[PDB]
């Protein structure tokens, strides 16, 4: 079991290096994903991170919805919207049949306040045929567990005739108790591309 | 006799205040005139007027052909082209029948070198139906006199068909002896608009 | 020991993914930490990394003290100050009782020169009650071992009263032999919030 244990740890590291899942993220910005800014909620205004240059104050820095499709998930590298209800629309890199979705959030052991109450709790994923479609086809309604692992995966709903989508909407219905905002660190879309 | 004198001085000042001519300048930039930048000559490069900010050299300043349709005619407020042959194409503010042209240059008494040898000597004015027309209709061949007044006016040629023009080309054939460049302070186009 | 061995590897990976320590870094910039640049040493001027655009040279690039509270610790992602003595003042994200500090530096196997002589050797950590306080309360006096691991942790001193701090000063007294400058890759502050 000695050489087998080394095979186990090397296999675990191999899966860890492949974006921790070994599956294509068709929402990743660098890989072709993009945010539809008009179809997204308004960014929570904090006005605390003051950017200056040569002592001249320039602007306050706040994370845009783009970070949600960016891999850096250190504390603060997240987009926040006011309240506990928000919506995020992502244009996928390719026309795919969605099979699973991944939501990532920082663990409580890395949060300064000692809790992840800003994390989303109840959410749903929809499939849109075009950018101007108000309500798309429901791909699945899930619940992010605050007591679960940092990375949580969610299987999409099975359908007999698999309709493909290149636009997905993430609707947050509630958070874990934060009275001001709700933070999204990373949202991934997994599936099979169309022939 | 005194009221007649004051009327003469007021009439001279009234004509002086009306752009020194009392005539519409359809080439004036602020009034609707513009320079066709592609249809011009190469600007004489001197690389002497160094513009800097906080000790950082930014760029060398040289007057563009736009200054030829700008009223400031203090020494230096002129566009220069290499040699004694140059072209300047101006889009008039309105479709007019050209009747006269005005060429302005600094007097000899205000030039540091003591001469106005950079002034144009022999020129012609043409009317173009479009920007891309190579050779236009001759509106008049004139000669700017260095021994004349600073402002010199030239009556357009009497042609059988009073064809209107909104694009004018100023062709300088020779200067008054400057071996390097030729300077144009202001060029005006006068006429009657179409109705 | 057949299925348990997989549990250890997953626990090690879980601790590795949680900023390699599983502890809050109250100095982390993205999490609320910030550098009080008016109370830091003069950044070492090197004038070598020339940034240009369309062939136009724009400026020389040098890392600011902000990188010390940023996680990327690849060789060069470090702030350098002239000499072997410097100071770095960080405003913590929350008012905490400091309990431990973390100093990171590249291993010898990744340094181009083959040595980490630019790494700090002897340092001390102080707690400041306000930005303008000159001499602060000593939180500990430690030594970064060049022959140790890349990440080294240091337990803070037990202060007599329960005095909290939101401003920390890192005073470097010596480096590991570099004659020109001293580099700091990442400095972390751990503790318990009030």
């Amino acid at each position: 079991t000695e050489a087998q244990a080394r095979a186990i740890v090397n296999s675990a590291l191999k899966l860890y290096s492949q974006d921790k899942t070994g599956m294509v993220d068709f929402a990743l910005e660098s890989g072709g994903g993009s945010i539809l800014s008009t179809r997204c909620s308004e960014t929570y205004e904090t006005k605390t991170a003051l950017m200056s240059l040569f002592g001249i104050p320039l602007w306050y820095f706040s994370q845009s919805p783009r970070v949600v499709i960016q891999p850096d998930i250190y504390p603060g590298n997240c987009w926040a919207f006011k309240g506990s209800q928000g919506y995020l629309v992502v244009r996928l890199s390719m026309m795919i049949h969605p099979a699973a979705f991944t939501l990532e959030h920082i663990p409580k052991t890395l949060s300064p306040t000692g809790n992840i109450s800003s994390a989303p709790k109840d959410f749903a994923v929809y499939g849109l045929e075009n950018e101007y479609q108000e309500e798309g086809q429901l791909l699945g309604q899930f619940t992010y567990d605050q007591d679960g692992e940092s990375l949580q995966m969610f299987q999409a709903l099975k359908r007999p005739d698999d309709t493909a989508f290149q636009i997905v909407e993430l609707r947050i219905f509630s958070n874990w108790g934060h009275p001001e905002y709700t933070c999204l660190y990373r949202f991934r879309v997994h599936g099979e591309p169309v022939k | 006799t005194e009221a007649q004198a004051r009327a003469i001085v007021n009439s001279a000042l009234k004509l002086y205040s009306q752009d020194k001519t009392g005539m519409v300048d359809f080439a004036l930039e602020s009034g609707g005139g513009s320079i066709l930048s592609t249809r011009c000559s190469e600007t004489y490069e001197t690389k002497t007027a160094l513009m800097s900010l906080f000790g950082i050299p930014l760029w060398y300043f040289s007057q563009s052909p736009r200054v030829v349709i700008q009223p400031d005619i203090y020494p230096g407020n002129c566009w220069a082209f290499k040699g004694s042959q140059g072209y300047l194409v101006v889009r008039l503010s309105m479709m007019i029948h050209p009747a006269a042209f005005t060429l302005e240059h600094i007097p000899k008494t205000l030039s540091p070198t003591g001469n106005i040898s950079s002034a144009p000597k022999d020129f012609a004015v043409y009317g173009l139906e479009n920007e891309y027309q190579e050779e236009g209709q001759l509106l008049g061949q004139f000669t700017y006199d260095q021994d004349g007044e600073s402002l010199q006016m030239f009556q357009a040629l009497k042609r059988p068909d009073d064809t209107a023009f909104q694009i004018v080309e100023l062709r300088i054939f020779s200067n008054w002896g400057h071996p390097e460049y030729t300077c144009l302070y202001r060029f005006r186009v006068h006429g009657e608009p179409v109705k | 020991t057949e299925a348990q061995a997989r549990a250890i590897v997953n626990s090690a990976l879980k601790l590795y993914s949680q900023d390699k320590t599983g502890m809050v870094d109250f100095a982390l910039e993205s999490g609320g930490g910030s550098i009080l640049s008016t109370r830091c040493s003069e950044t070492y001027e090197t004038k070598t990394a020339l940034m240009s655009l369309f062939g136009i040279p724009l400026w020389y690039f040098s890392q600011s003290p902000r990188v010390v509270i940023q996680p990327d610790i690849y060789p060069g992602n470090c702030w350098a100050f002239k000499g072997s003595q410097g100071y770095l003042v960080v405003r913590l994200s929350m008012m905490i009782h400091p309990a431990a500090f973390t100093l990171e530096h590249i291993p010898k196997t990744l340094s181009p020169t083959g040595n980490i002589s630019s790494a700090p050797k002897d340092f001390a950590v102080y707690g400041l009650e306000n930005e303008y306080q000159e001499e602060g309360q000593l939180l500990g006096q430690f030594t970064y071992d060049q022959d140790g691991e890349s990440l080294q942790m240091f337990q803070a001193l037990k202060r007599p009263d329960d005095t909290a701090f939101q401003i920390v000063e890192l005073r470097i007294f010596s480096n590991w032999g570099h004659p020109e400058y001293t580099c700091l890759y990442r400095f972390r502050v751990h503790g318990e919030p009030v």
């Binding site: 929570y44 904090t46 006005k47 605390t48 991170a49 003051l50 950017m51 200056s52 240059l53 040569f54 820095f61 706040s62 994370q63 504390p75 603060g76 997240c78 926040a80 920082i106 949060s111 300064p112 306040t113 800003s118 905002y181 933070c183 | 000790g55 950082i56 050299p57 | 910039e29 993205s30 999490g31 609320g32 930490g33 910030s34 550098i35 640049s37 950044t43 001027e45 004038k47 020339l50 040279p57 724009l58 400026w59 020389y60 690039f61 040098s62 600011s64 902000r66 405003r91 994200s93 929350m94």
Partner: peptide, 25 residues
């Protein structure tokens, strides 16, 4: 390197300061 002595601007340091508490985490 434009010539022997080039007036290259001083190194720009983009400073970040927190003046209104914690950012969204």
């Amino acid at each position: 390197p434009c010539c022997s002595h080039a007036r290259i601007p001083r190194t720009p340091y983009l400073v970040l300061s927190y003046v209104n508490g914690l950012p969204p985490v």
